[PDB]
């Protein structure tokens, strides 16, 4: 595969890491494994210390008071790479074994055995108006030349890679996370009776949260507002230990209650930071840099056997709670990410050009033949690059993602390989089912350059619609319903097809974030909405020009750990004349 | 029941002294604040800039006085600026207090409560203090402002500025009233003050003494020497304010404990020195304050490579 | 009622120049200095200087209240005379210095650029404050205060026992106050006149042939024109055109049914030559944008 790899200022000291993101099985974590690459010559005598630091940061500009440093470490380990004697006694990891054969009289294997018991690496809201490193739990491994732990530490010759802490969803699913209250008040009826209950216990991360309320006002007493509010608790027990709280998804409904009556509704909140930028203290999930992530993932304490950790503990709840003419109820449910198959891309995937250089246009080969179609970028992508199969008029489909993985649901008739920029697909045997141009993408970068179309001879779903031709320089506003995709978990890629020619990306939103990214050569005019009430994809149009004529597909995308372009609508046809 | 005899001619001097000494640092730190604002950005600034310009107006009024004193304790001016700067001069009393205090609790927030400090926004909140901060200031030494009035003549032709309590105070009560406004004064001058201070440089130091515990060596020296700042800071404090405390109470107390006159014209005698002691606070707070806020002093004067990529063989 | 009537017009103009000069002191703080230019710094300093004109005024407020009394305090009364005549020179001063670098900037420096840098106008404001403040120096020393009568009226007049001599007191005085009135308003006036008569005759030469424009921008240079003259004329000249004529009386013998005149008077012109630095923050913000 493709591993990590960070060189001193100097370059003596490469650390290969394979994975900056270590999962964090709650009895016990995975080995933060790795090789630290050092030259013999210039270490004359000295040695190579590999050091694993969970820092805990909470004042902005440590020493700010003019001494006072502002950072803790929650734990800490050292492991001395070199040189290495039995009293390491340490078995090579697949990835350690794997990396020292790829070097050569550099292999230095570290492990680090972290304990079970430590906070997720979540930062804090660096706070829009406040500067600074967030105030929050963060780990690092860094490879220092030294030949005494307390010897000076020199930063022209260490290291040093961010690593993540981040804890995936359980695959056993948890219990309703349900809750009910009732209280009295000056009527001697009935207390309110008050029952919240969610879809489960386990929601991936941006997926819809279904609060489902019922109340019953037998007393005279009346509700005038409803609020449903999933709040971010951040358990910092540093130092003085306290809950705080800060609303993440807030829904305040006017729905009211009359006396004698009984009241249910199932409300529908959905995380998402875009709206949640300014609230400082707010919890963010494992950044290497200042880059956008995800509200928190909850902790997954041991089960049981908390003993208030040290740091920012992480939890999520939905507060359910109704005015009366103030009855509350919580429901403790868990928003953490799904395990995705492959290491996820912390970078903003497609972020802020490329040509993609692909080849042969055209080539004729019978069933069941060997053939490869290739392809070139003019910078690097790095395997995040996909593919995409268009038979004459019909949606292209992703075939290859990642440059490796085969896409579920499609035949390993077809298999990537990345070699530096040329990125190739290689068929086992073409099968009947070839009649199709194989296009190439890459989502590096906002500029989503498609491959220029590779024509092979072989000798749920978006409905979109709402199109209209014949306008010279006119508006429009093509329309893409998405039957099972929420936009707050998925990513919309307007693309267009012009005449025999590869497609050129339009226009791609993103909910949970909020930017959106308009295409270089169609700018002021081409704009993107997607309503969420009704998961509809609005591309709004305006001052067409003659070649802005083509067939427009409306995209589908998993907004965390961007994939490919997978599922895809019929296409629309638009034509610019009289 | 006189006062000393070197006094009417050495507390002008000493009045005058503190004049020259607190505005050159406090018109100083005022221009510097003013023109470093948007670089420093920092809750304590506004701070720092009201205690500035409560030492500024704590000073500038003194001038008059030094000269009433030099004319045998008989006030030249108008009744009115008799007022104006008997209130400017308790106002600013008050307030050099209250800034020192809310610098401790802006402190208090940025060392021994971090997380608290940075979810806060410190900007809002340090301007929102600092309105209270003055407006609390104004309102709570608004009695002055008629209190102090010129008149009794005493067949001598002096017009003496004094604290007038005959227009509010009744002539049995005029005890009574006098005391529950010096009390009021002294109370809400150090009382509260200074027991929030107490507790605030206590958690502050066990705080910064905790977190130096270790690490190295050297962060035992400059532990100690952040525990020597805030020693000399508060023991500062203690020796300019608590002579001017302990004399008002001495003062009131002579009147039930009936202290010998010996030892009342003692504090008679002492008490313009207290004065000026306390003015020592605004004298001092330039240096105290501002010069140990690096940028002050400021304004008035390697790389970590790029995460690569390689790929295996299988 | 005069001398009751007077007063409050002080409070009006106490109260007007406290809200002008305060947002024009305010706005011209807000720009930075990349802003900020020699135009920028002298109409601060005129600003200034209008505001201490005002804000030293209540205490002569008060003073005509009690019919030219002076109850607060001796010495003040000689710091608030020099601050009034300090603050009025400068300001005078400092709109002739804005004129004259308007003149030396608009079509000057194409022609002929021989001229001080922007940066040292600073140097130029503080050389002009200094020139105010020794040519205000007498004022304050001649000012001390007395009853004047059986009575206790006390109040500063300008005393000359300095001269030590009763009859050089007319001649010193005299001398004085003509030296002190010509250098306020004849050299001022007579320098911001000749610019404006300057820039008159280029825009005569220059606006011959008719443009698009050229009637709206000749009206509103006629208005900034008029209303730049007649903001000094009708503020400052009555004044030391009265102080002219009290001075020269005696020596003209004016009958008393003037010289009495020329004391009415001179409450009511000391007003309406206030209202000018409280008038001056608005004119120059409406034309601010004109004059660039
Ligand atoms: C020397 O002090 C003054 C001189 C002039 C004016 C004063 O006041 C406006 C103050 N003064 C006062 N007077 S006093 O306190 O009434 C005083 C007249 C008399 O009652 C008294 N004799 C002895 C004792 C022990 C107590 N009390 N109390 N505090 C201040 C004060 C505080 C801080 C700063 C300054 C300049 N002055
Ligand atoms: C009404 O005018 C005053 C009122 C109060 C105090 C004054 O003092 C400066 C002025 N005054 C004065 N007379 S005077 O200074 O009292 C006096 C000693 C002498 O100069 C004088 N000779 C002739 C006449 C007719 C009057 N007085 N001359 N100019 C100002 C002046 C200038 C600018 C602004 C103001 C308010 N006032």
């Given at each position: 595969?493709?591993?990590?790899?960070?060189?001193?200022?100097?370059?003596?000291?490469?650390?290969?890491?394979?994975?900056?993101?270590?999962?964090?099985?709650?009895?016990?974590?995975?080995?933060?494994?790795?090789?630290?690459?050092?030259?013999?010559?210039?270490?004359?005598?000295?040695?190579?210390?590999?050091?694993?630091?969970?820092?805990?940061?909470?004042?902005?500009?440590?020493?700010?008071?003019?001494?006072?440093?502002?950072?803790?470490?929650?734990?800490?380990?050292?492991?001395?790479?070199?040189?290495?004697?039995?009293?390491?006694?340490?078995?090579?990891?697949?990835?350690?074994?794997?990396?020292?054969?790829?070097?050569?009289?550099?292999?230095?294997?570290?492990?680090?055995?972290?304990?079970?018991?430590?906070?997720?690496?979540?930062?804090?809201?660096?706070?829009?108006?406040?500067?600074?490193?967030?105030?929050?739990?963060?780990?690092?491994?860094?490879?220092?030349?030294?030949?005494?732990?307390?010897?000076?530490?020199?930063?022209?010759?260490?290291?040093?890679?961010?690593?993540?802490?981040?804890?995936?969803?359980?695959?056993?699913?948890?219990?309703?996370?349900?809750?009910?209250?009732?209280?009295?008040?000056?009527?001697?009826?009935?207390?309110?009776?008050?029952?919240?209950?969610?879809?489960?216990?386990?929601?991936?991360?941006?997926?819809?949260?279904?609060?489902?309320?019922?109340?019953?006002?037998?007393?005279?007493?009346?509700?005038?507002?409803?609020?449903?509010?999933?709040?971010?608790?951040?358990?910092?027990?540093?130092?003085?230990?306290?809950?705080?709280?800060?609303?993440?998804?807030?829904?305040?409904?006017?729905?009211?209650?009359?006396?004698?009556?009984?009241?249910?509704?199932?409300?529908?909140?959905?995380?998402?930071?875009?709206?949640?930028?300014?609230?400082?203290?707010?919890?963010?999930?494992?950044?290497?840099k200042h880059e956008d992530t995800n509200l928190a993932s909850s902790t997954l304490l041991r089960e049981g056997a908390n003993?208030?950790?040290?740091?920012?503990?992480?939890?999520?709840?939905?507060?359910?709670?109704?005015?009366?003419?103030?009855?509350?109820?919580?429901?403790?449910?868990?928003?953490?990410?799904?395990?995705?198959?492959?290491?996820?891309?912390?970078?903003?995937?497609?972020?802020?050009?490329?040509?993609?250089?692909?080849?042969?246009?055209?080539?004729?080969?019978?069933?069941?033949?060997?053939?490869?179609?290739?392809?070139?970028?003019?910078?690097?992508?790095?395997?995040?690059?996909?593919?995409?199969?268009?038979?004459?008029?019909?949606?292209?489909?992703?075939?290859?993602?990642?440059?490796?993985?085969?896409?579920?649901?499609?035949?390993?008739?077809?298999?990537?390989?990345?070699?530096?920029?040329?990125?190739?697909?290689?068929?086992?045997?073409?099968?009947?089912?070839?009649?199709?141009?194989?296009?190439?993408?890459?989502?590096?970068?906002?500029?989503?350059?498609?491959?220029?179309?590779?024509?092979?001879?072989?000798?749920?779903?978006?409905?979109?619609?709402?199109?209209?031709?014949?306008?010279?320089?006119?508006?429009?506003?093509?329309s893409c319903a998405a039957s099972g995709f929420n936009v707050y978990s998925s990513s919309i890629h307007w693309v267009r097809?012009?005449?025999?020619?590869?497609?050129?990306?339009?226009?791609?939103?993103?909910?949970?974030?909020?930017?959106?990214?308009?295409?270089?050569?169609?700018?002021?005019?081409?704009?993107?909405?997607?309503?969420?009430?009704?998961?509809?994809?609005?591309?709004?149009?305006?001052?067409?020009?003659?070649?802005?004529?083509?067939?427009?597909?409306?995209?589908?995308?998993?907004?965390?750990?961007?994939?490919?372009?997978?599922?895809?609508?019929?296409?629309?046809?638009?034509?610019?004349?009289? | 029941?006189?006062?000393?005899?070197?006094?009417?001619?050495?507390?002008?001097?000493?009045?005058?002294?503190?004049?020259?000494?607190?505005?050159?640092?406090?018109?100083?730190?005022?221009?510097?604040?003013?023109?470093?604002?948007?670089?420093?950005?920092?809750?304590?600034?506004?701070?720092?800039?009201?205690?500035?310009?409560?030492?500024?107006?704590?000073?500038?009024?003194?001038?008059?006085?030094?000269?009433?004193?030099?004319?045998?304790?008989?006030?030249?001016?108008?009744?009115?600026?008799?007022?104006?700067?008997?209130?400017?001069?308790?106002?600013?009393?008050?307030?050099?207090?209250?800034?020192?205090?809310?610098?401790?609790?802006?402190?208090?927030?940025?060392?021994?409560?971090?997380?608290?400090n940075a979810r806060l926004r410190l900007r809002v909140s340090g301007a929102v203090a600092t309105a209270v901060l003055w407006?609390?200031?104004?309102?709570?030494?608004?009695?002055?402002?008629?209190?102090?009035?010129?008149?009794?003549?005493?067949?001598?032709?002096?017009?003496?500025?004094?604290?007038?309590?005959?227009?509010?105070?009744?002539?049995?009560?005029?005890?009574?009233?006098?005391?529950?406004?010096?009390?009021?004064?002294?109370?809400?001058?150090?009382?509260?003050?200074?027991?929030?201070?107490?507790?605030?440089?206590?958690?502050?130091?066990?705080?910064?003494?905790?977190?130096?515990?270790?690490?190295?060596?050297?962060?035992?020296?400059?532990?100690?020497?952040?525990?020597?700042?805030?020693?000399?800071?508060?023991?500062?404090?203690?020796?300019?304010?608590?002579?001017?405390?302990?004399?008002?109470?001495?003062?009131?107390?002579?009147?039930?404990?009936?202290?010998?006159?010996?030892?009342?014209?003692?504090?008679?005698?002492?008490?313009?020195?207290?004065?000026?002691?306390?003015?020592?606070?605004?004298?001092?707070?330039?240096?105290?304050?501002?010069?140990?806020?690096?940028?002050?002093?400021?304004?008035?004067?390697?790389?970590?490579?790029?995460?690569?990529?390689?790929?295996?063989?299988?």
């Amino acid at each position: 595969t493709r591993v990590f790899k960070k060189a001193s200022p100097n370059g003596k000291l490469t650390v290969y890491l394979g994975k900056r993101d270590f999962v964090d099985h709650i009895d016990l974590v995975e080995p933060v494994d790795g090789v630290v690459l050092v030259d013999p010559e210039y270490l004359k005598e000295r040695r190579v210390y590999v050091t694993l630091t969970a820092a805990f940061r909470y004042g902005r500009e440590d020493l700010d008071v003019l001494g006072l440093t502002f950072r803790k470490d929650l734990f800490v380990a050292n492991v001395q790479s070199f040189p290495p004697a039995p009293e390491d006694k340490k078995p090579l990891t697949r990835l350690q074994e794997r990396l020292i054969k790829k070097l050569g009289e550099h292999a230095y294997p570290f492990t680090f055995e972290i304990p079970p018991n430590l906070p997720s690496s979540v930062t804090l809201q660096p706070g829009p108006e406040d500067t600074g490193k967030a105030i929050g739990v963060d780990y690092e491994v860094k490879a220092f030349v030294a030949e005494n732990l307390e010897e000076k530490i020199h930063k022209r010759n260490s290291v040093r890679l961010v690593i993540e802490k981040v804890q995936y969803a359980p695959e056993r699913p948890g219990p309703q996370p349900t809750a009910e209250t009732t209280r009295q008040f000056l009527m001697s009826d009935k207390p309110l009776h008050l029952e919240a209950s969610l879809d489960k216990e386990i929601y991936y991360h941006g997926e819809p949260i279904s609060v489902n309320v019922h109340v019953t006002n037998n007393t005279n007493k009346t509700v005038k507002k409803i609020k449903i509010s999933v709040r971010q608790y951040a358990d910092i027990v540093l130092f003085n230990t306290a809950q705080y709280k800060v609303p993440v998804a807030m829904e305040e409904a006017d729905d009211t209650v009359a006396p004698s009556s009984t009241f249910s509704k199932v409300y529908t909140l959905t995380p998402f930071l875009a709206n949640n930028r300014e609230k400082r203290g707010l919890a963010l999930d494992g950044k290497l840099k200042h880059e956008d992530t995800n509200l928190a993932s909850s902790t997954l304490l041991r089960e049981g056997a908390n003993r208030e950790i040290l740091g920012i503990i992480v939890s999520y709840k939905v507060k359910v709670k109704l005015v009366v003419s103030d009855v509350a109820v919580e429901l403790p449910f868990t928003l953490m990410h799904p395990k995705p198959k492959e290491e996820p891309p912390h970078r903003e995937v497609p972020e802020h050009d490329i040509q993609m250089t692909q080849s042969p246009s055209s080539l004729s080969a019978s069933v069941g033949d060997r053939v490869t179609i290739t392809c070139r970028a003019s910078q690097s992508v790095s395997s995040a690059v996909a593919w995409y199969q268009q038979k004459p008029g019909k949606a292209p489909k992703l075939l290859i993602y990642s440059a490796s993985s085969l896409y579920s649901g499609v035949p390993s008739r077809f298999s990537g390989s990345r070699s530096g920029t040329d990125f190739t697909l290689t068929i086992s045997s073409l099968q009947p089912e070839d009649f199709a141009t194989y296009y190439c993408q890459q989502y590096k970068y906002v500029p989503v350059t498609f491959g220029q179309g590779t024509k092979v001879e072989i000798k749920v779903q978006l409905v979109e619609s709402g199109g209209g031709l014949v306008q010279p320089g006119g508006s429009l506003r093509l329309s893409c319903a998405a039957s099972g995709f929420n936009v707050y978990s998925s990513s919309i890629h307007w693309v267009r097809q012009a005449p025999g020619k590869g497609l050129e990306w339009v226009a791609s939103i993103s909910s949970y974030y909020g930017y959106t990214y308009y295409a270089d050569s169609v700018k002021g005019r081409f704009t993107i909405s997607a309503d969420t009430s009704k998961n509809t994809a609005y591309l709004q149009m305006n001052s067409l020009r003659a070649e802005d004529t083509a067939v427009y597909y409306c995209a589908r995308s998993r907004q965390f750990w961007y994939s490919g372009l997978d599922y895809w609508g019929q296409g629309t046809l638009v034509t610019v004349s009289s | 029941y006189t006062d000393w005899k070197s006094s009417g001619a050495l507390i002008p001097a000493i009045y005058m002294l503190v004049f020259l000494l607190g505005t050159t640092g406090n018109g100083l730190v005022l221009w510097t604040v003013f023109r470093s604002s948007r670089e420093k950005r920092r809750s304590a600034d506004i701070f720092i800039a009201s205690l500035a310009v409560a030492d500024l107006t704590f000073v500038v009024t003194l001038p008059l006085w030094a000269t009433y004193t030099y004319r045998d304790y008989d006030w030249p001016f108008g009744t009115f600026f008799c007022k104006l700067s008997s209130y400017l001069i308790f106002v600013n009393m008050y307030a050099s207090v209250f800034c020192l205090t809310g610098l401790s609790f802006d402190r208090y927030l940025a060392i021994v409560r971090p997380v608290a400090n940075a979810r806060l926004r410190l900007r809002v909140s340090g301007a929102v203090a600092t309105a209270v901060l003055w407006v609390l200031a104004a309102l709570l030494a608004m009695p002055v402002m008629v209190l102090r009035t010129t008149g009794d003549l005493e067949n001598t032709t002096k017009v003496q500025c004094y604290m007038d309590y005959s227009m509010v105070a009744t002539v049995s009560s005029e005890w009574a009233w006098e005391v529950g406004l010096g009390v009021s004064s002294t109370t809400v001058g150090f009382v509260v003050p200074f027991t929030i201070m107490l507790t605030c440089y206590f958690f502050i130091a066990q705080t910064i003494a905790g977190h130096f515990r270790k690490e190295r060596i050297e962060g035992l020296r400059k532990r100690r020497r952040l525990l020597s700042i805030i020693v000399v800071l508060v023991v500062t404090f203690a020796l300019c304010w608590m002579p001017y405390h302990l004399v008002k109470t001495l003062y009131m107390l002579g009147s039930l404990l009936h202290w010998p006159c010996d030892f009342d014209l003692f504090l008679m005698n002492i008490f313009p020195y207290c004065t000026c002691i306390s003015y020592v606070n605004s004298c001092l707070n330039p240096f105290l304050y501002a010069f140990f806020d690096p940028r002050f002093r400021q304004a008035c004067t390697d790389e970590s490579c790029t995460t690569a990529s390689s790929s295996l063989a299988k």
